[PDB]
Design a protein around this ligand. Sequence first.
Ligand SMILES: COc1ccccc1CNC(=N)c1nn(-c2cccc(C)c2)nc1N
Ligand SMILES: O=C(O)CN(CCN(CC(=O)O)CC(=O)O)CC(=O)O
Length: 387
Amino acid sequence: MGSSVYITVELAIAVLAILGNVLVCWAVWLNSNLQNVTNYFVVSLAAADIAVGVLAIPFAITISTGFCAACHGCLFIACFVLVLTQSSIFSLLAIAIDRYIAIRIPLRYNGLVTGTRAKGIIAICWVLSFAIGLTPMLGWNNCGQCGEGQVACLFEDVVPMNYMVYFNFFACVLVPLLLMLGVYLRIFLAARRQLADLEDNWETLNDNLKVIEKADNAAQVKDALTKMRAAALDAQKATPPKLPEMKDFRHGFDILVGQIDDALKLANEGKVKEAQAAAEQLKTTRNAYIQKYLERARSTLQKEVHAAKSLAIIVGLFALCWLPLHIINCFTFFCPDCSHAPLWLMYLAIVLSHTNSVVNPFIYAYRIREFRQTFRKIIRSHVLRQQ
Ligand SMILES: COc1ccccc1CNC(=N)c1nn(-c2cccc(C)c2)nc1N
Ligand SMILES: O=C(O)CN(CCN(CC(=O)O)CC(=O)O)CC(=O)O
């Protein structure tokens, strides 16, 4: 029977959505390291994911087939998952904003994103999600056309199809959904490419520094030095130290290149052994002046890629799960002449949306390493409090 597989899966998902996200909250709370403000919103997301696994899913199973209830009451069952959805779109929105305010402006952050302003941002969304989510209950419903005073609750017969498309989807979801991927797919892409270039330069001058020490004639030296001077110049304009004022950075490269030129001058003059002797100085010159920034830059990007990629995946799946259900509501509203999407497809669109509140923990398990071994960290944190 298909109906059992539905309720079987519906309950199965509800279990994971609860257990998965509840684990996140323990790690976010038990583990001290995972207590960064960015996880404050991770909790708001997991809290909404928990509410979906507890209340939303049962509410869905019931309205799946309809039921007799008041119009002012049945809107809760049908339009409660709406609040949890907008809350998610608000939580992801914050994490996307919290991560951007730290990638492009790592300076004015700890004075810009305090623990208190964050706590207020979350509540203002839930009360605004309750407002956006439970909007049809203010007096925008189709329960006009059971017992005395009760109306047949079936969603599409109660929820205005123009509220799910124009407002909920377009304004409250589609706008924010596109807003986040377009930014972090670029940040993840620009960073992805930028990190690759920075390494090819560090490796090309690190490699060509060796070809000079073990070189035969003056040609090999003149050619490597040229390739080195290319990498240094490329790296020079590629590693801005955030923050021309107070930059002991442009001086660094100009000390390095200054010796590459003296070396090319040596090689060009046919002084190979004398030119390769200056190559060892370059190692010392690289380690002394430039090595500091090469590493500092390669680290900042490894965080941009891992964070944008992570946040992109979270938002990526969130948009990949909630779109089919919104696409149907669009193909249904803009083409009333089209046959309404079949239940077997409608059901499949509802079931998928419930999964988004399950992947988040899995994503964190496949991405956040701290959250991963956080159990062994909680244990050790307790056994240590014994001597
Ligand atoms: C017959 O199909 C079902 C299967 C399981 C449970 C309920 C139903 C009835 N459909 C619905 N309640 C239903 N929700 N939608 C919906 C669309 C976007 C966002 C949110 C939160 C909800 N869009 C709908 N059509
Ligand atoms: O989801 C993200 O934005 C990426 N992580 C960054 C990675 N995390 C986990 C880790 O790699 O240790 C850093 C952290 O929590 O210490 C943000 C966050 O920490 O909340």
